[PDB]
Design an enzyme around this catalytic site. Structure first.
Site, PDB file in Angstrom:
ATOM      1  N   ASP A 141      76.847 -28.314 -43.280  1.00 55.36           N
ATOM      2  CA  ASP A 141      76.804 -28.036 -44.566  1.00 55.36           C
ATOM      3  C   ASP A 141      76.617 -29.446 -45.450  1.00 55.36           C
ATOM      4  O   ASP A 141      76.994 -29.123 -46.463  1.00 55.36           O
ATOM      5  CB  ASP A 141      77.769 -27.124 -44.970  1.00 55.36           C
ATOM      6  CG  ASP A 141      79.081 -27.413 -44.624  1.00 55.36           C
ATOM      7  OD1 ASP A 141      79.538 -28.709 -44.320  1.00 55.36           O
ATOM      8  OD2 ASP A 141      79.925 -26.605 -44.739  1.00 55.36           O
ATOM      9  N   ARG A 159      76.516 -31.615 -50.339  1.00 50.97           N
ATOM     10  CA  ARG A 159      77.233 -30.647 -50.016  1.00 50.97           C
ATOM     11  C   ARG A 159      76.569 -29.313 -50.306  1.00 50.97           C
ATOM     12  O   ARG A 159      76.246 -29.219 -51.657  1.00 50.97           O
ATOM     13  CB  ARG A 159      78.707 -30.687 -50.240  1.00 50.97           C
ATOM     14  CG  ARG A 159      79.491 -29.446 -50.143  1.00 50.97           C
ATOM     15  CD  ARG A 159      79.628 -29.331 -48.433  1.00 50.97           C
ATOM     16  NE  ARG A 159      80.837 -28.170 -48.196  1.00 50.97           N
ATOM     17  CZ  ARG A 159      80.452 -27.038 -48.010  1.00 50.97           C
ATOM     18  NH1 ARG A 159      79.294 -26.579 -48.330  1.00 50.97           N
ATOM     19  NH2 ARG A 159      81.424 -26.318 -47.507  1.00 50.97           N
ATOM     20  N   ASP A 178      79.709 -22.307 -46.337  1.00 46.39           N
ATOM     21  CA  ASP A 178      80.790 -22.962 -45.262  1.00 46.39           C
ATOM     22  C   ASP A 178      80.082 -22.886 -43.667  1.00 46.39           C
ATOM     23  O   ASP A 178      80.306 -21.785 -43.103  1.00 46.39           O
ATOM     24  CB  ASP A 178      81.926 -22.495 -45.340  1.00 46.39           C
ATOM     25  CG  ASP A 178      83.167 -23.469 -44.992  1.00 46.39           C
ATOM     26  OD1 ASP A 178      83.101 -24.507 -45.125  1.00 46.39           O
ATOM     27  OD2 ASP A 178      84.372 -22.799 -44.396  1.00 46.39           O
ATOM     28  N   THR A 179      79.876 -23.969 -43.407  1.00 48.44           N
ATOM     29  CA  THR A 179      79.585 -23.953 -41.825  1.00 48.44           C
ATOM     30  C   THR A 179      80.988 -24.417 -41.093  1.00 48.44           C
ATOM     31  O   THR A 179      81.872 -25.026 -41.616  1.00 48.44           O
ATOM     32  CB  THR A 179      78.483 -24.969 -41.235  1.00 48.44           C
ATOM     33  OG1 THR A 179      78.947 -26.250 -41.871  1.00 48.44           O
ATOM     34  CG2 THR A 179      77.240 -24.685 -41.971  1.00 48.44           C
ATOM     35  N   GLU A 205      83.470 -26.562 -38.878  1.00 43.76           N
ATOM     36  CA  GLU A 205      83.467 -27.919 -38.641  1.00 43.76           C
ATOM     37  C   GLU A 205      82.957 -28.108 -37.384  1.00 43.76           C
ATOM     38  O   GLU A 205      83.116 -27.112 -36.566  1.00 43.76           O
ATOM     39  CB  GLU A 205      84.996 -28.574 -38.907  1.00 43.76           C
ATOM     40  CG  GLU A 205      85.470 -28.426 -40.036  1.00 43.76           C
ATOM     41  CD  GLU A 205      84.793 -29.052 -41.551  1.00 43.76           C
ATOM     42  OE1 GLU A 205      84.389 -30.111 -41.289  1.00 43.76           O
ATOM     43  OE2 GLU A 205      84.625 -28.274 -42.327  1.00 43.76           O
ATOM     44  N   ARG A 242      80.440 -35.925 -53.522  1.00 42.32           N
ATOM     45  CA  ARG A 242      79.238 -35.368 -52.850  1.00 42.32           C
ATOM     46  C   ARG A 242      78.329 -34.452 -53.812  1.00 42.32           C
ATOM     47  O   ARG A 242      78.874 -34.263 -54.720  1.00 42.32           O
ATOM     48  CB  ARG A 242      79.545 -34.464 -52.022  1.00 42.32           C
ATOM     49  CG  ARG A 242      80.440 -35.029 -50.890  1.00 42.32           C
ATOM     50  CD  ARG A 242      80.899 -33.959 -49.668  1.00 42.32           C
ATOM     51  NE  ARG A 242      81.624 -33.235 -50.243  1.00 42.32           N
ATOM     52  CZ  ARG A 242      82.402 -32.085 -49.473  1.00 42.32           C
ATOM     53  NH1 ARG A 242      82.267 -32.042 -48.300  1.00 42.32           N
ATOM     54  NH2 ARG A 242      83.109 -30.995 -50.253  1.00 42.32           N
TER      55      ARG A 242
HETATM   56  C1  LIG Z   1      80.914 -26.135 -51.438  1.00 44.82           C
HETATM   57  C2  LIG Z   1      81.919 -26.974 -52.441  1.00 44.82           C
HETATM   58  C3  LIG Z   1      83.080 -27.573 -51.975  1.00 44.82           C
HETATM   59  N1  LIG Z   1      83.947 -28.109 -52.716  1.00 44.82           N
HETATM   60  C4  LIG Z   1      84.982 -28.611 -52.389  1.00 44.82           C
HETATM   61  C5  LIG Z   1      86.080 -27.676 -52.369  1.00 44.82           C
HETATM   62  C6  LIG Z   1      87.123 -27.947 -51.263  1.00 44.82           C
HETATM   63  O1  LIG Z   1      88.245 -28.898 -51.693  1.00 44.82           O
HETATM   64  P1  LIG Z   1      89.331 -29.218 -50.513  1.00 44.82           P
HETATM   65  O2  LIG Z   1      89.061 -30.382 -49.716  1.00 44.82           O
HETATM   66  O3  LIG Z   1      90.313 -29.341 -51.496  1.00 44.82           O
HETATM   67  O4  LIG Z   1      89.413 -27.910 -49.459  1.00 44.82           O
HETATM   68  C7  LIG Z   1      86.081 -28.659 -50.332  1.00 44.82           C
HETATM   69  C8  LIG Z   1      85.299 -28.055 -49.071  1.00 44.82           C
HETATM   70  O5  LIG Z   1      84.104 -28.759 -48.528  1.00 44.82           O
HETATM   71  P2  LIG Z   1      84.100 -28.717 -46.774  1.00 44.82           P
HETATM   72  O6  LIG Z   1      83.799 -27.469 -46.551  1.00 44.82           O
HETATM   73  O7  LIG Z   1      83.223 -29.738 -46.686  1.00 44.82           O
HETATM   74  O8  LIG Z   1      85.620 -29.210 -46.503  1.00 44.82           O
HETATM   75  O9  LIG Z   1      84.955 -29.288 -51.180  1.00 44.82           O
HETATM   76  C9  LIG Z   1      83.513 -28.018 -54.240  1.00 44.82           C
HETATM   77  O10 LIG Z   1      84.490 -28.444 -54.959  1.00 44.82           O
HETATM   78  N2  LIG Z   1      82.743 -27.177 -54.926  1.00 44.82           N
HETATM   79  C10 LIG Z   1      81.829 -26.828 -53.859  1.00 44.82           C
HETATM   80  O11 LIG Z   1      80.728 -26.379 -54.312  1.00 44.82           O
HETATM   81 CA   LIG Z   2      82.279 -26.985 -43.882  1.00 45.40          CA
END
Ligand SMILES: Cc1cn([C@H]2C[C@H](OP(=O)(O)O)[C@@H](COP(=O)(O)O)O2)c(=O)[nH]c1=O
Ligand SMILES: [Ca+2]
Length: 129
Positions: free
Chosen positions: A15, A29, A34-35, A37, A75
Site C-alpha cells: 500500500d 500511501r 491496509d495491506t 506488512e 507520505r
Molecule cells: C492510510 C492512512 C494512514 N495514515 C497514518 C495513520 C497510521 O498512523 P500510525 O503510524 O500512528 O499507526 C499510519 C498507518 O499507515 P501504515 O499502514 O502504512 O503503517 O499512517 C493517515 O494518517 N492517513 C491515512 O489516510
Molecule cells: Ca499496511
C-alpha cells in the site's frame, strides 16, 4: 477529483509506492486501504501485486481526495491508477487489502471499495479464506 500524472520511481509494499510527482520524488500511501506488512501473511503477495500492477502500467496517475494530501509521515495520500485501473480498488477486490483508515474528508471512493471488499469476502479470497 482529478487525475494527475506521475512515474514509478520504486516499488515499496502493498500500500506504499515511491513515485515522481510534479518532478519530485515522493512516497505515496494508498488511501482507504491496509495491506498486511511484508512480514505478515499475504504481505508478500500484496507487495508483489502492487509492484507488478504499477510497474507494468505504461501510465500512472495520482488522484488526491478533498482532505489531507500528506500524512504525518510526509507520505502523499492518494488513489493511484495503473492504465486507468485503481490499484487501491484492485487490492481490495482480490482480498489483498482491507478497507481501512477511513477519515472524513478523504473518503470519496469508500463505498466503491467496500463493494469490492464485500465481493472479495464473498469469494473467500486471500485474506478472507
Ligand atoms: C492510510 C492512512 C494512514 N495514515 C497514518 C495513520 C497510521 O498512523 P500510525 O503510524 O500512528 O499507526 C499510519 C498507518 O499507515 P501504515 O499502514 O502504512 O503503517 O499512517 C493517515 O494518517 N492517513 C491515512 O489516510
Ligand atoms: Ca499496511
Amino acid at each position: 477529483l482529478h487525475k494527475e500524472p506521475a512515474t514509478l520511481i520504486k516499488a515499496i509494499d502493498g500500500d506504499t509506492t515511491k513515485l515522481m510527482y510534479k518532478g519530485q520524488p515522493m512516497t505515496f500511501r494508498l488511501l482507504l486501504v491496509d495491506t498486511p506488512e511484508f512480514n505478515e501473511k499475504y504481505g508478500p503477495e500484496a507487495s508483489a501485486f502492487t509492484k507488478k500492477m504499477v510497474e507494468n502500467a505504461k501510465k500512472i496517475e495520482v488522484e488526491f481526495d478533498k482532505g489531507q494530501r500528506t500524512d504525518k509521515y510526509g507520505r502523499g495520500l492518494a488513489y493511484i491508477y495503473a492504465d486507468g485501473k485503481m490499484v487501491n480498488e484492485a487490492l481490495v477486490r482480490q482480498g489483498l487489502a482491507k478497507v481501512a483508515y477511513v477519515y472524513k474528508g478523504n473518503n470519496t471512493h469508500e463505498q466503491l471499495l467496500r463493494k469490492a471488499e464485500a465481493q472479495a469476502k464473498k469469494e473467500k479470497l486471500n485474506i478472507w479464506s
